[PDB]
Amino acid sequence: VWKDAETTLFCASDAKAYETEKHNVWATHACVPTDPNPQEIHLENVTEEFNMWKNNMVEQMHTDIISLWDQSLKPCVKLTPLCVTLQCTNVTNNITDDMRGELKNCSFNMTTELRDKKQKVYSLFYRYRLINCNTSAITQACPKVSFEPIPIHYCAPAGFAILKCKDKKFNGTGPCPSVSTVQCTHGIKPVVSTQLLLNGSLAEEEVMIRSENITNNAKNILVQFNTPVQINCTRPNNNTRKSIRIGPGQAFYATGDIIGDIRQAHCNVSKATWNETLGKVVKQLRKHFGNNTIIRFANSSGGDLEVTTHSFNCGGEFFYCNTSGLFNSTWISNDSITLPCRIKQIINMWQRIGQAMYAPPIQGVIRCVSNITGLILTRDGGSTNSTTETFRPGGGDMRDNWRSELYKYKVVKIE
């Protein structure tokens, strides 16, 4: 009998406790040892209907991964002073020498571990005086922590089983006659990014575009690639030399002093590489909308930076890379693209519940490598004279990251 389930999740991994990375310990300590040597039993003449858009597994995973943040904002990560008015100066100083209005070196009186002993020190704003806090500003990065998506395996509930559709082209919302029972999931990483899908799954056949209602322009357009595109993100400069904690509730997080070749950060990815994939996408789209309709892509028309540009986590530090150039083109039915990005630490997590703030990056520079495995777009629409259809970068609901994986998974109850 094929019922449910609905709902629960049981995470797991083979990562050892020797690693202290935040996502590793969320899978090593907050979850249980996994089971290597995966195995599937294909069902014989059985058709299972999936529903990714009302899938409780996605809801659970979305809640859980967000809830995992509670694990950090409790022990060591805090919401405390200081928010003393920081007074900002010009670019500092000798080695840079750069046209960057984003790195704001601002000074303030920092109270030490001593009751009433202040000290003039420097910090960094990004984007006068102030321009900080005024909200649930959750500070402190603590030692170790470190954020990077780690493969987490989810195994069937006690008494229940996980069904997995093996359909190379599955809308995630229909019947699948090709379905197998599997002990646990392949291992789903807590991908933290907007607009772009980093290190997700790939379609077996062609680029799979999915959306509850593709005609409904409030719905996000999930575009699962059949090929990876390597994004190599690198910090051109260096600074914030490690962390210097001051007192029980005091810390010199940020600045450093060593500075370097300060300049706008960015990621390297051959522009032709994902230009290929955009070719694939517009071919899929035009076949969905008119069978011969011109497909135009455009950048964000506004909104919070987090969803306006490509926000993603690299090593705990959040980068906001403007990828307008990756959209600004039209497809009618050695050079690489270089995207301008910005590092923050202030991030809006949950539903405006608070703003997590980490730092310092520690050490210097940084390198993160992740392969794009799909996009999230949103269609404009128009009248009968719309002709060419316009897609702009979407995002805003990280749950989509889980949808792109769980569309083929479904826990089931048997009698």
């Epitope: 509850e212 409904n216 919070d304």
Partner: antibody, heavy 125, light 102 residues
Framework: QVQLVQSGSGVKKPGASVRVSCWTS?????????IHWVRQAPGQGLEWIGW?????????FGSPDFRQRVSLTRDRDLFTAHMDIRGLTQGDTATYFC????????????????WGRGTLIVVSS | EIVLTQSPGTLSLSPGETASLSCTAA????MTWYQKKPGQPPKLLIF???KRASGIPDRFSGSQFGKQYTLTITRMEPEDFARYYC?????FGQGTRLEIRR
């Protein structure tokens, strides 16, 4: 369906700009995902403008014309929505409403929980 | 095809009669339908095609035949006469004026 508290009716000139405000109680603001906007010409039907997300502030419109002409901003802390229109033209003379679309509308189409009071914007020198 | 063709543009029927409005969709999907009185904001009467909103009289029913969105208003009262509009996603219909037949 308690009306969403909009700004008073206003008169601007061609080439001018205006921020038409619309705000309501916390509950409704938290119930609604996007804030949409729609205008009607005098003696005409409904002409849909665009929407702005209450979670992210992301925007999208029925036309690039609205993308440039109309800037939709929002503030959760103030539970208020702003509509800024620049390069006001004669054809922008119309009555404007905001409308709230709750979460979990599924595939039921665009239905709205609350509607705005209504703001008449006139563009004339 | 134009997204919506709401008709007729004007419908005059006497009190106690049943109004039958047709909004022809260019596509498939669930429909919504609003009342709008003179000087008053639009007001959701029917959503999801055939699911009336809370606080809406049962005499307001809805359906669809293929793409022909159907709207039924039985036993119309004198206070049930106004402007009405269909909507499919971000698009509105042509608009209808419901009037009293004399």
């Amino acid at each position: 369906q308690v009306q969403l508290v909009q700004s008073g009716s206003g008169v601007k000139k061609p080439g001018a700009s205006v921020r038409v405000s619309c705000w309501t109680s916390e509950d409704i603001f938290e119930r609604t995902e996007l804030i949409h906007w729609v205008r009607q010409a005098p003696g005409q039907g409904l002409e849909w403008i665009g929407w702005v997300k209450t979670v992210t502030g992301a925007v999208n419109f029925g036309s690039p014309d609205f993308r440039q002409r109309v800037s939709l901003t929002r503030d959760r802390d103030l539970f208020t929505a702003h509509m800024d229109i620049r390069g006001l033209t004669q054809g922008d003379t119309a009555t404007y409403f905001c409308a709230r679309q709750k979460f979990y509308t599924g595939g039921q189409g665009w239905y709205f929980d609350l509607w705005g009071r209504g703001t008449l914007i006139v563009v004339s020198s | 095809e134009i997204v919506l063709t709401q008709s007729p543009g004007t419908l005059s029927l006497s009190p106690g009669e049943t109004a039958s409005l047709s909004c022809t969709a260019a596509s498939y999907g669930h429909m919504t339908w609003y009342q709008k009185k003179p000087g008053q904001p639009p007001k959701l009467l029917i959503f999801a095609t055939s699911k009336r909103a809370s606080g809406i009289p049962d005499r307001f029913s809805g359906s669809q035949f293929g793409k022909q969105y159907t709207l039924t208003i039985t036993r119309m009262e004198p206070e049930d006469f106004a402007r009405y509009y269909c909507q499919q996603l971000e698009f509105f219909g042509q608009g209808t004026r419901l009037e009293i037949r004399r």
